[PDB]
Structures are given as structure tokens and as C-alpha cells.
UniProtKB/Swiss-Prot annotation:
Lyses staphylococcal cells by hydrolyzing the polyglycine interpeptide bridges of the peptidoglycan. This is Lysostaphin. Monomer. The chain holds residues 401 to 493 of 493 of the full protein. It is found in: Secreted. Residues 13-81 form the SH3b domain. It comes from the Bacteria. It comes from Staphylococcus simulans. Belongs to the peptidase M23B family.
Length: 93
């Protein structure tokens, strides 16, 4: 199913690979666009995530970056009122 954290983020464990088809802004700290930008995952650059979150109008995946800091990558839009998902911005493998 899902779990809900202190901050009303829906989350659960899920290990797989995401290759974006477009440049996506990654965040530090948590799955919100108001969070500091960690950087940009470029089109075709595969990452291996261990977490999935629904929050701030998006489905995010969370992984551990190259400084042991968690990185939050948005992969598609999510309306919580309808639980509707936009096109995935890449392929899960
Ligand atoms: C229970 C119910 N849902 C509820 O009403 N909760 C509120 C939360 C209020 C709160 O915490 N505010 C923050 C500032 C938030 C605005 C600022 N927003 C944030 O900081 C957001 N923070 C994060 O997202 C943290 N990162 C993650 O979580 C990453 N993990 C996941 O996303 C999912 N995975 C997991 O969770 C794994 N276990 C605040 O006051 N901060 C003060 C200083 C402090 O702590 O004293 C409440 N009244 O308690």
C-alpha cells in the first residue's frame, strides 16, 4: 500500500532503475520544488532508486547521491484530489 510521514508525504520502499527522456531538476532534503536544487539528472542518465514518494503534485523517487546525501527526483505529475498520474518522464527498468 503506502505510508504517510510527519509532512503528509505518501511513501514506500521500491528498488528499480529510472532513465529520464528529458533533463529533470533533482532536490535535496525532501520531495518539494521549494527544496534546494541538488542538481539536474540529464536525459538518458540511468539512476537506481530505493524509495518512491507522492507529494507536491508529483511522484518522486529517492536515492543516495555521491556525498551520502538523499536526492529527490520528480518523474511524473500527480493530482492527489484524483490520484491521477501524468506521463512518466522516462522508463523504469
Ligand atoms: C501528523 C500530521 N501529518 C501533521 O499535522 N504534521 C505536522 C508537521 C509540521 C512540521 O513538521 N512542520 C515543519 C516545517 C514544515 C515546512 C518545511 N518542510 C519540510 O521540512 C519538509 N521536510 C521533509 O520533507 C523531510 N524529508 C523527508 O521526509 C524525506 N523522506 C520522505 O519524503 C519520505 N520518506 C520517509 O519519510 C522515510 N521514513 C517544522 O515545524 N519544522 C521544525 C524546524 C521542527 O521540526 O521543529 C505537525 N503539526 O506535526
Amino acid at each position: 500500500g503506502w505510508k504517510t510521514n510527519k509532512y503528509g508525504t505518501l511513501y514506500k520502499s521500491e528498488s528499480a532503475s529510472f532513465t529520464p527522456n528529458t533533463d529533470i531538476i533533482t532536490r535535496t532534503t525532501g520531495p518539494f520544488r521549494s527544496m534546494p536544487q541538488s542538481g539536474v539528472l540529464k536525459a538518458g542518465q540511468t539512476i537506481h532508486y530505493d524509495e518512491v514518494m507522492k507529494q507536491d503534485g508529483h511522484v518522486w523517487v529517492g536515492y543516495t547521491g555521491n556525498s551520502g546525501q538523499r536526492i529527490y527526483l520528480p518523474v511524473r505529475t500527480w493530482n492527489k484530489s484524483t490520484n491521477t498520474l501524468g506521463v512518466l518522464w522516462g522508463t523504469i527498468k
